[PDB]
Design an enzyme around this catalytic site. Sequence first.
Site, short mmCIF file in Angstrom:
data_model
loop_
_atom_site.label_atom_id
_atom_site.label_comp_id
_atom_site.label_asym_id
_atom_site.label_seq_id
_atom_site.Cartn_x
_atom_site.Cartn_y
_atom_site.Cartn_z
N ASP A 1 -9.21 -15.73 -2.50
CA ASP A 1 -8.35 -16.29 -3.54
C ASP A 1 -8.68 -17.75 -3.84
O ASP A 1 -8.49 -18.21 -4.97
CB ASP A 1 -6.88 -16.16 -3.14
CG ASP A 1 -5.93 -16.31 -4.31
OD1 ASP A 1 -6.41 -16.49 -5.45
OD2 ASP A 1 -4.71 -16.26 -4.09
N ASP B 1 5.06 -4.26 -0.51
CA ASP B 1 4.86 -3.05 0.29
C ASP B 1 5.91 -1.98 -0.01
O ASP B 1 5.59 -0.90 -0.53
CB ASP B 1 4.87 -3.42 1.77
CG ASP B 1 6.05 -4.31 2.15
OD1 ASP B 1 6.86 -4.63 1.25
OD2 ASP B 1 6.17 -4.69 3.33
#
Length: 733
Positions: free
Chosen positions: A140, A472
């Site tokens: 990133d 998640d």
Amino acid sequence: DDRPVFRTEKIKGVLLHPYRVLIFVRLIAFTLFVIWRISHKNPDAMWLWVTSICGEFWFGFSWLLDQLPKLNPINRVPDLAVLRQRFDRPDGTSTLPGLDIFVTTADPIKEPILSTANSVLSILAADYPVDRNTCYVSDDSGMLLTYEALAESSKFATLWVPFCRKHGIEPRGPESYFELKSHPYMGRAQDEFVNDRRRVRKEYDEFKARINSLEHDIKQRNDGYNAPRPTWMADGTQWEGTWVDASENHRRGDHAGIVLVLLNHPSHRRQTGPPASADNPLDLSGVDVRLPMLVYVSREKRPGHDHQKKAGAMNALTRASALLSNSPFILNLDCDHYINNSQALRAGICFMVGRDSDTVAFVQFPQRFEGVDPTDLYANHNRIFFDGTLRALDGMQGPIYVGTGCLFRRITVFVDTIPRASHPSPYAAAAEGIVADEATIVEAVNVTAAAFEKKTGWGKEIGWVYDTVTEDVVTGYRMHIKGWRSRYCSIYPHAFIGTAPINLTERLFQVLRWSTGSLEIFFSKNNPLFGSTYLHPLQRVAYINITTYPFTAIFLIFYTTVPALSFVTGHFIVQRPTTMFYVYLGIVLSTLLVIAVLEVKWAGVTVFEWFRNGQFWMTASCSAYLAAVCQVLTKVIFYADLYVVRWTPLMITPIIIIFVNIIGSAVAFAKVLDGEWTHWLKVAGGVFFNFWVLFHLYPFAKGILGKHGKTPVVVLVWWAFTFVITAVLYINI
């Protein structure tokens, strides 16, 4: 053969049947208890009576939510012989499908690049078909340190991976292997093997030295070429991404998209190594030396556009994968999570290739942590949770996505490239190997832009939802809302090893992060009450639990303050307990203890670690959940390294709960010993329960002192000192 690829282990009837009948009598006893409490009002403390019955109702509701989906645990293990006979071919070929592996990292200076190097060396040396395992690394930050680390790892793989394949090195992690004191003494040679061990020791030491001098080398190289400073690549071209020196078009968060293939497609034909020589005496006659995919991607970031951190990073990764390899199966891992068992890939693919595999969308893998002391004083493993709740949810339909170490199937969910992925037969896209040519590069650059996220549904209505913290469980919910199941694997040794949270400051930060994510997902529109009718009630109630558990704190704080208020005001919760009431409490306590011992027995864990995780989860509910809920309401309105401790304000909330209770215990003791109600006999035990509270508030209280909190020789002395001081103070007045 057609032997089922999954061995099943069932709970013994003499254990399972008592477990379920005891849960049934538990719920019946709770219904009787709440009926008794409702019927028998307390006129003296009617407000307190209402608060107490509401709190007990909430606690029982939470216990029901937690215990209802744990009724029927079934253990599931894989096997490899059936796969090796069915899908593996003796001619050196295979019929296995493709697979994508994601490695996500955020920033090179906060997270150790050594962990990323270990992870990439473990995934590159995995025992999987070379031409079908495609690797993606989402850095990133977009730093050249990681780029050249991966490039040098690709150079070093040509001699590392054949060694790992031939001599059965496990785990594939280099430093983990070299840290193994005993070693299984595997290896086709003995003298050549030990000579190889020592020479690879020296070569990996100089390789580590090169790693540690890489930043020096790159900065000297940049200075030499530059004598808006770019990071010049080895071929003398201009790095168009994140420059260390920022300006209008190259400031952090303003770059373009780049697609580069560090390691291109290996040849379909099996490659043999060089023969016996001097520089490379390693015999490679029977060892394959092929090199898997290695590609780099840098997603587009624009001002005013939410790049959405790791979620968006992995969306960009999976969008690029559908072009480069179009693999239906996609596993993801963090930077610090590396492979410990090289057979985890097969243990995951067995469920995907077995019968009735269409319903199974994703498979979660065990998330294990290293560095924990053998005595397990602080329970960093979280075994009693992972193998306690998820291992039971696995039994009937399947677990939930937890955040890492999971593999997805994508066929369930670029606009003109959709037909290639959604064709009924995707195997026609791998026979003609697509080279990393200019046409493919330019098409990837064209269709991997973030400009397609506007006026479309990606992220807003399907895929990984944005404006949320924990992807998640929310992704698991949006996936199961359409009607899919899931599986789980539990094998020894550990499939993956991750880095445990390091020191107290970020441990508190990450528990707060988890609680805040849970509260944020609850705040959104995904409440399970209005879910689709296809969802089975069992995972509906499981979802209710997994999305409203952090609300225990708002009543737990009150329940912990109840002893102090009662002992300072002279009022009991029940003015005069009856024989039936005492019997009901005794039965409830005994049944809870039997449930606890039964679950410890069937989960393969011990009472010590159960009790430690219980202490930790009580402390977390006491402090972190309260901090998260107050933050949410405010937002709505508007080894040795472990022994370093730094003060933070976030810890001040347990302190009062410690000290008001400590003061109140002795106040009540003196109140009773003054001679008010002499005969303690059948009310005897409350102080013992107080000691119980001490044992469940012990972990954080011991750990706050830190290094000086090495032994309780000071903690218990200070507790007794405070106790005697407050006793003397109350005796005086």
